[PDB]
Coordinates of C-alpha atoms in Angstrom, one line a residue:
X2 CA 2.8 -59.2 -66.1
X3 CA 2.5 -59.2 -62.3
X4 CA 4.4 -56.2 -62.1
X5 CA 2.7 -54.0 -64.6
X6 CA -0.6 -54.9 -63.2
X7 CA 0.4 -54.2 -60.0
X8 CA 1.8 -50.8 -60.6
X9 CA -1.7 -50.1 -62.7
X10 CA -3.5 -50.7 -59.8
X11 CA -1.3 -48.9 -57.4
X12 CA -1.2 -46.0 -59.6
X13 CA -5.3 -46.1 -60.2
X14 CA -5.1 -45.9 -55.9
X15 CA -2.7 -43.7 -55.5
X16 CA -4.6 -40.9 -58.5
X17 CA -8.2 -41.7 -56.5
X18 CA -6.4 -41.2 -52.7
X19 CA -3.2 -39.4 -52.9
X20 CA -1.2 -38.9 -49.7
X21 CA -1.2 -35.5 -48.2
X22 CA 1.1 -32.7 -49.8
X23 CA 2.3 -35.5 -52.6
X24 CA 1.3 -37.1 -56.0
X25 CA 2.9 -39.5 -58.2
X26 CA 2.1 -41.1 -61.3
X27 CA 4.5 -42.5 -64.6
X28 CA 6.3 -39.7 -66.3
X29 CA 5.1 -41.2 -69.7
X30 CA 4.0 -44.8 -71.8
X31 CA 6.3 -46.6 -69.3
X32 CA 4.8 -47.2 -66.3
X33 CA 7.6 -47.9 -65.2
X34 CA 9.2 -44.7 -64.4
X35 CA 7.4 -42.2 -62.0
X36 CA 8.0 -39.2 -60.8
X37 CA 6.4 -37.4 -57.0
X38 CA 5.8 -34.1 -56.0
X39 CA 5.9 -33.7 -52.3
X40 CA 5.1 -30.4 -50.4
X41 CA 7.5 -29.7 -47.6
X42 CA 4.8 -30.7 -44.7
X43 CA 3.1 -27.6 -43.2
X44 CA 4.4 -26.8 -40.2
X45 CA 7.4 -28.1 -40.3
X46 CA 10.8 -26.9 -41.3
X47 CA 10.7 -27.8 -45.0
X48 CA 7.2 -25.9 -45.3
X49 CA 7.2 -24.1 -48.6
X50 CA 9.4 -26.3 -50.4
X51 CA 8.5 -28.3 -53.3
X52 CA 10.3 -31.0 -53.7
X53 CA 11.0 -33.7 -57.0
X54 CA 11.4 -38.0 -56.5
X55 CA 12.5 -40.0 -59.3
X56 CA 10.6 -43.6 -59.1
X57 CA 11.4 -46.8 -60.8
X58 CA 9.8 -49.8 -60.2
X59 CA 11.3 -52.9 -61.1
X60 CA 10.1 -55.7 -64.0
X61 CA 10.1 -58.4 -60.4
X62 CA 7.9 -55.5 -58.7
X63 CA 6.3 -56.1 -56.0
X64 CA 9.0 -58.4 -55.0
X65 CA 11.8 -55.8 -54.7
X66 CA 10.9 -52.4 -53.7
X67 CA 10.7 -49.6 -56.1
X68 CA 14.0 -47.4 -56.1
X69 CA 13.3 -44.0 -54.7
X70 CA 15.7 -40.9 -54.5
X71 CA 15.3 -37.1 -54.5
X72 CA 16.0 -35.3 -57.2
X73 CA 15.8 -31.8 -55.0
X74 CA 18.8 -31.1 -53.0
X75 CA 17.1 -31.3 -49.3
X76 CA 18.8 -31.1 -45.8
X77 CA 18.0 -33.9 -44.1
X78 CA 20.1 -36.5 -42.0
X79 CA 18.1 -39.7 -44.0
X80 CA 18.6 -37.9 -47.2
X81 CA 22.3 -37.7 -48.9
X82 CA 23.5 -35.5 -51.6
X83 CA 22.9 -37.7 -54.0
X84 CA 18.8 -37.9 -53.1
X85 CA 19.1 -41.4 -51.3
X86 CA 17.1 -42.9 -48.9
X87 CA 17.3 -44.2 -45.5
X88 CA 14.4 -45.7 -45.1
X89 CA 14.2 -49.2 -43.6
X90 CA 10.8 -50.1 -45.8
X91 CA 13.3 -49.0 -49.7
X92 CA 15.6 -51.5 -48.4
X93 CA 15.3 -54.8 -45.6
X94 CA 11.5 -54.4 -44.4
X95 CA 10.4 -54.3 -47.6
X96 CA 7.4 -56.5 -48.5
X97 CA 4.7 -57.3 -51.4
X98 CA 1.6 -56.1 -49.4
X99 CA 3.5 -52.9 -49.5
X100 CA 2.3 -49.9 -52.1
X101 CA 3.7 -46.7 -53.6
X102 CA 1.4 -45.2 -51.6
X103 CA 2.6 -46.3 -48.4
X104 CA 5.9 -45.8 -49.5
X105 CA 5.6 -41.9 -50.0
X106 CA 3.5 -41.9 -46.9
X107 CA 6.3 -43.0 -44.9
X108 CA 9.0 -40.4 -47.0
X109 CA 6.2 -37.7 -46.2
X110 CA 6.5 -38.8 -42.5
X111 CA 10.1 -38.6 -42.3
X112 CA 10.1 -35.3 -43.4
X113 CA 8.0 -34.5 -40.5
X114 CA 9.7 -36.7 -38.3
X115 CA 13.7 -37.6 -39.2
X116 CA 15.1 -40.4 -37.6
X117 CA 18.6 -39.0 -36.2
X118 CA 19.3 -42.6 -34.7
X119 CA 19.3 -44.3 -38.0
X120 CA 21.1 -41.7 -39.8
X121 CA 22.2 -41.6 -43.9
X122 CA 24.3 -38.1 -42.9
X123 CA 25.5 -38.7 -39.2
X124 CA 27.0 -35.3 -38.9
X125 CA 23.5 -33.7 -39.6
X126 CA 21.5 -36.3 -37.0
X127 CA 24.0 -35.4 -34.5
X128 CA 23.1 -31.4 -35.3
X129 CA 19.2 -31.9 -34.9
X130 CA 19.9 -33.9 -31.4
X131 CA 23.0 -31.3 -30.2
X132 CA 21.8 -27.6 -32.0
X133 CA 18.3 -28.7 -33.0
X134 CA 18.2 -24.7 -33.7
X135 CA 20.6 -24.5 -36.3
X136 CA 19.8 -28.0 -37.8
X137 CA 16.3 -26.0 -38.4
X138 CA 18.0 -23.0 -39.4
X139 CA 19.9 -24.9 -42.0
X140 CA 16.9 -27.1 -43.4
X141 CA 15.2 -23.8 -43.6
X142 CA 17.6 -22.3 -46.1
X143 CA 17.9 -24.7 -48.0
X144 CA 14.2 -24.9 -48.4
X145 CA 14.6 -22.1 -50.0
X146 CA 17.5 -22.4 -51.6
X147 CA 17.3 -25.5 -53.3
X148 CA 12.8 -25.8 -53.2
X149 CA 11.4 -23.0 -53.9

């Protein structure tokens, strides 16, 4: 089908050129259902951390995106308690010449960089931009926690 053959071929690209600190792939016969493994970036304040993403691509895939959530608790203002998130290309900018790839690129890049302005947990964006010292403090801890 168009989705199957699309997550084939994303998942052959993804296993030849994996994004830094992550991998991905199906967690058995249906290639449907992936799971990640993304590395807390180096450097930053989730360093260390090892971190779980459920994937599920849908049967209209690539016309919807594929639904995305952390299974490991993380701190993080565009990341809930209930691993969902905010990211603008899971949900409105979505589009077909997208890839899973570029989709856990982006979730690696937000744990570099959060996005306090476009927040999922508005009391921990207003800590990184008010105490950016205990918002670190924090994500630290439960790096190691909840990651490790």
């Amino acid at each position: 089908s168009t989705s199957a053959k699309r997550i084939q071929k994303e998942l052959a690209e993804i296993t030849l050129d994996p994004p830094p600190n992550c991998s991905a792939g199906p967690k058995g016969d249906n290639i449907y259902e992936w799971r990640s493994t993304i590395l807390g970036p180096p450097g930053s304040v989730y360093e260390g951390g090892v971190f779980f993403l459920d994937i599920t691509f849908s049967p209209d895939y690539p016309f919807k995106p594929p639904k995305v959530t952390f299974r490991t608790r993380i701190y993080h203002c565009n990341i809930n308690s209930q691993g969902v998130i905010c990211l603008d290309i899971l949900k409105d900018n979505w589009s077909p010449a997208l890839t899973i790839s570029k989709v856990l690129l982006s979730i690696c890049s937000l744990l570099t960089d959060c996005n306090p302005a476009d927040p999922l947990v508005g009391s921990i964006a207003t800590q990184y931009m008010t105490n950016r010292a205990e918002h670190d403090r924090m994500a630290r801890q439960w790096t190691k926690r909840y990651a490790t």
